[PDB]
């Protein structure tokens, strides 16, 4: 329909002048790894000690 194409081109025009597409620029922080392979051996070390 006319509304749908109008909205799509409105999004594209929003992009064109500036990245205002909802403009989510990630902060590029590190990963969130939490397994901590060493922690699995904590119980074994404690029992051995």
């Amino acid at each position: 329909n006319f509304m749908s194409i109008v909205n799509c081109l409105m999004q594209l025009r929003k992009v064109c002048n500036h990245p205002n597409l909802f403009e989510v620029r990630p902060i590029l922080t590190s990963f969130v790894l939490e397994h901590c392979v060493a922690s699995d051996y904590k119980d074994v070390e404690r029992t051995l000690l």
Binding site: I5, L9, L12, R13, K14, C16, N17, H18, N20
Partner: protein
């Protein structure tokens, strides 16, 4: 769109230009005084407008340049905006610059307008 006025204000503040903005959010009383302040001699070099707010019937004459970020359907109202500076109180040549990206929707719009002598564009595709 008014969502780029704040972006322009931030950019000009970062670049340290003497700017001053007018749009639909600006109060009625301040509008005429701001227009008079800009039209009179001053150190202000950049003046921010809106397509529908003040791009219609103001008599700005101090400026000499017009910059357009975008124009979707522009037979007369964009001509009106660019001629807002080109008034009878102007004594210098008018330079108009249009911002169009490459391989984008605006580029295709301009190409189709040039091919069709800029009569009317309803559907744009490539």
């Amino acid at each position: 769109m008014t969502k780029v006025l704040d972006v322009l204000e931030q950019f000009l503040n970062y670049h340290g230009y003497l700017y001053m903005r007018l749009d639909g959010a600006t109060k009625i009383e301040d509008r005429q005084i701001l227009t008079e302040r800009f039209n009179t001699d001053s150190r202000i070099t950049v003046f921010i407008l809106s397509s529908r707010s003040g791009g219609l019937g103001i008599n700005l004459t101090g400026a000499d340049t017009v910059i357009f970020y975008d124009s979707d359907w522009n037979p007369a109202m964009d001509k009106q905006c660019q001629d807002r500076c080109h008034r009878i109180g102007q004594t210098r040549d008018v330079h108009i610059y249009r911002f169009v990206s490459e391989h984008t929707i605006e580029s295709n719009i301009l190409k189709k307008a040039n091919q069709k002598r800029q009569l009317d564009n309803v559907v744009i595709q490539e």
